């Protein structure tokens, strides 16, 4: 059960220290061959190697970033730590963690979403799509938050096929998407339908029920 | 540093059809150990990459047979033998022999499948919308291919482009399709205003525009 997962921020002003953690399970740190790596992706563009620690505390950084670059490991606790030293609007990207046993990255975190911006955070509306108020289609729409990520969920995840969730669209400062499940008619509205929106920098999580009218 | 290149920089192929994706390296990949550290990944759709090849040719645990690595010092080759609907998404070849560790630019791998007209829904703006003083008219174009496809909205016959946004869903894992949404969004008073609010979609499968309609 190898497992990674990154926690940060989700926003930060310019010119401030980014922290990000690396929590893991599955594998030990100061077990030897082990190593825990920082890659990041602008969105849309390419990834970018940042840094790692072995088992044995040698760190690797990548040379256009490296004196801004701090890597750490706690073994004990089995965390590695990134800090970032004063950020710029070009460190807005998605960052991961990733186990190196050899050779490689082979897991591969969640990744955490970082934006650097100077605005405040603030958490989206959701509106039903009902229509309208053999198979049906509904959803939930998402407007007016910042910044990314949303996380949109149908039933606490219990129902996952049939839904399309399409790609966020900036306007005016502020991001919105649309998601939408085609469940059968017998379906709904005769059993409950859920959308679960989260947006963990504002610390938000709302629902929605699809009604009928 | 080592500039990985790699080649086409998106490719689309029918389902069970064969795939190859080239990386080539500035530099050699073959370090002192005398291996070469050239890994493969996969990275789909809202998700983190997943390693698939490494060291040029070794398969990682849980990964299909379909896929396969070979090449040698510079040169490395990433296969798709049969092209499943699951294997959508973004492939990117890693050297770790040299020190930065550098990542080719990514190869977007699209399937090509048997067209496919969309479906259409309008969904009027919500109540609880209207109560804060806008009004979103979405509508809502589902499993087309291909991805390309015309959106026009008409507000009581008459055609309206301000405030319009438009929104594509990333090809779909299982049938290959494309989702989108157009959404007209208004003030309450101004939605008050009219009756009569029409999208309609032109894509390639049909010359005739599928409209969808409410009056209010």
């Known amino acids: 059960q190898i497992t990674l997962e990154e926690s940060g921020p989700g926003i930060l002003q310019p010119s401030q220290t980014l922290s990000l953690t690396c929590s893991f399970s599955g594998f030990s740190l100061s077990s030897s061959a082990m190593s825990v790596g920082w890659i990041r992706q602008p969105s849309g563009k390419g990834l970018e190697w940042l840094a790692h620690?072995?088992?044995?505390?040698?760190?690797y950084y990548n040379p256009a970033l490296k004196s801004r670059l701090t890597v750490s490991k706690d073994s004990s606790d089995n965390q590695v730590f990134l800090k970032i030293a004063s950020v710029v609007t070009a460190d807005t990207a998605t960052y991961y963690c990733?186990?190196?046993?050899?050779?490689?990255?082979?897991?591969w975190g969640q990744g955490t979403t970082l934006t650097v911006s100077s605005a405040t955070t603030t958490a989206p509306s959701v509106y039903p799509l009902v229509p309208g108020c053999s198979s049906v289609t509904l959803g939930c729409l998402v407007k007016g938050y910042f910044p990314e990520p949303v996380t949109v969920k149908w039933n606490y995840g219990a129902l996952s096929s049939g839904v399309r969730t399409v790609s966020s669209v900036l306007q005016s400062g502020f991001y919105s998407l649309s998601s939408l499940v085609t469940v059968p008619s017998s379906t709904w509205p005769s059993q409950t339908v859920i959308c679960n929106v989260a947006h963990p920098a504002s610390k938000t999580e709302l629902i929605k029920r699809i009604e009928p009218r | 540093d080592v500039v990985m290149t790699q080649t086409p920089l998106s490719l689309s192929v029918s389902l069970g059809d064969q795939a190859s994706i080239s990386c080539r390296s500035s530099?050699?990949?073959?370090?002192?150990?005398?291996?070469?550290?050239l890994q493969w990944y996969l990275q789909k759709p809202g998700q983190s990459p997943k390693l698939l090849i490494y060291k040029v040719s070794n398969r990682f645990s849980g990964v299909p047979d379909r896929f396969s690595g070979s090449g040698s010092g510079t040169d490395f080759t990433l296969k798709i033998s049969r092209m499943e609907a699951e294997d959508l998404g973004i492939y990117f070849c890693?050297?770790?022999?040299?020190?930065?560790?550098?990542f080719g630019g990514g190869t977007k791998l699209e399937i090509k499948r048997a067209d496919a007209a969309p479906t259409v829904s309008i969904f009027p703006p919500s109540s609880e919308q209207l109560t804060s003083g806008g009004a979103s008219v979405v509508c809502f174009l589902n499993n087309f291919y291909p991805k390309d496809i015309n959106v026009k909205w008409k507000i009581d016959g008459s055609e309206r482009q301000n405030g319009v946004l438009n929104s594509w869903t990333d090809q779909d894992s299982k049938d290959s399709t494309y989702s989108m949404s157009s959404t007209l969004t208004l003030t309450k008073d101004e939605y008050e205003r009219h009756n009569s609010y029409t999208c309609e979609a032109t894509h390639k499968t049909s010359t005739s525009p599928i409209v969808k309609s409410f009056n209010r």
């Open positions: 890693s050297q770790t022999t040299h020190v930065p560790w550098t």
């Open positions: 530099q050699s990949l073959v370090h002192s150990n005398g291996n070469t550290f």
């Open positions: 990733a186990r190196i046993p050899g050779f490689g990255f082979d897991y």
């Open positions: 620690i072995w088992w044995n505390d040698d760190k």
